[PDB]
Design a protein around this ligand. Structure first.
Ligand SMILES: CCCCCCCCCC(=O)NCCCC(=O)O
Ligand SMILES: [Co+2]
Ligand SMILES: [Co+2]
Length: 250
């Protein structure tokens, strides 16, 4: 069984210093990068991958002033980019969703999690546990009483939707391997590679544990050699130019 539709849904944007996409570069040039969520229409119901940025980021580029990352991360988010507004425009309310999948709990992926208080939120145990104490996590991304479905390692969500454990960028980061009716095998790296060159050329990028991130890339390359998927990266300005986005699907 395959997924019926895989939608790429723009969920606002974020400025990052360009040393975050290539650790070699000298800081000083910001890049206006895409923030994504993905909607999977399946036999069993709709599944949302990631939930955009938090409320506090709306009309607030200076959100991280006063923090260790001041000036080097600036969210670009309007009221329209709140995940409940995105969902409503597409045609859903939060309680319609079968599952939320959190690739990881960075603020541009889990900022909207609080809107889903009934839907199971599938997240790696190592990511959940890290978010409870590491300083790069926002309180909006680790709310205590949501319906977490904590998993450990690779996991089949529904037929055609596989989670691949890809730690390194964050301690419990996970990627998606999807089989769609229209396109066959699709690999969503999410932040296991911001860009094509992080993946193909193993250019280092921002992460918790870059050595681990490299071994997760190598693991994904083994999957790619076996399955030959089309591959989409997490924060790639170049690839964004040719991506099919909502209302188009793959
Ligand atoms: C509470 C103050 C710190 C919160 C932000 C720390 C950012 C590092 C981790 C992070 O959120 N990176 C986002 C860039 C794209 C991504 O990697 O998701
Ligand atoms: Co991230
Ligand atoms: Co990200």
């Amino acid at each position: 069984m395959t997924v019926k539709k895989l939608y790429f849904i723009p969920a606002g944007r974020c400025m990052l210093d360009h040393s975050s996409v290539n650790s070699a570069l000298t800081p000083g040039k910001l890049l206006n990068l895409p923030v994504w969520c993905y909607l999977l229409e399946t036999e069993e119901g709709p599944i949302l991958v990631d939930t955009g940025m938090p409320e506090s980021a709306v009309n607030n580029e200076g959100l991280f002033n006063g923090t260790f990352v001041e000036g080097q991360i600036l969210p670009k988010m309007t009221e329209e980019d709140r995940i409940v507004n995105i969902l409503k425009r597409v045609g859903y309310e939060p309680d319609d969703l079968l599952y939320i999948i959190s690739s990881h709990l960075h603020f541009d992926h889990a900022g909207g999690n609080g809107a889903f208080t009934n839907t199971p939120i599938i997240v790696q145990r190592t990511e959940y546990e890290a978010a409870l104490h590491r300083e790069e996590y926002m309180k909006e991304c680790i709310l205590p009483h949501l319906n977490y479905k904590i998993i450990e390692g690779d996991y089949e969500v529904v037929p055609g939707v596989q989670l691949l454990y890809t730690p390194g960028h964050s301690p419990g980061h996970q990627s998606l391997f999807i089989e769609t009716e229209q396109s066959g095998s699709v690999l969503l790296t999410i932040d296991a590679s911001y860009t094509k060159e992080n993946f193909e050329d193993e250019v280092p990028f921002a992460g918790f544990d870059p050595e681990l991130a490299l071994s997760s890339i190598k693991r994904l390359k083994e999957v790619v050699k076996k399955e030959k998927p089309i591959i989409f990266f997490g924060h790639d300005i170049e690839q964004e130019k040719s991506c099919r986005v909502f209302p188009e699907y793959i």
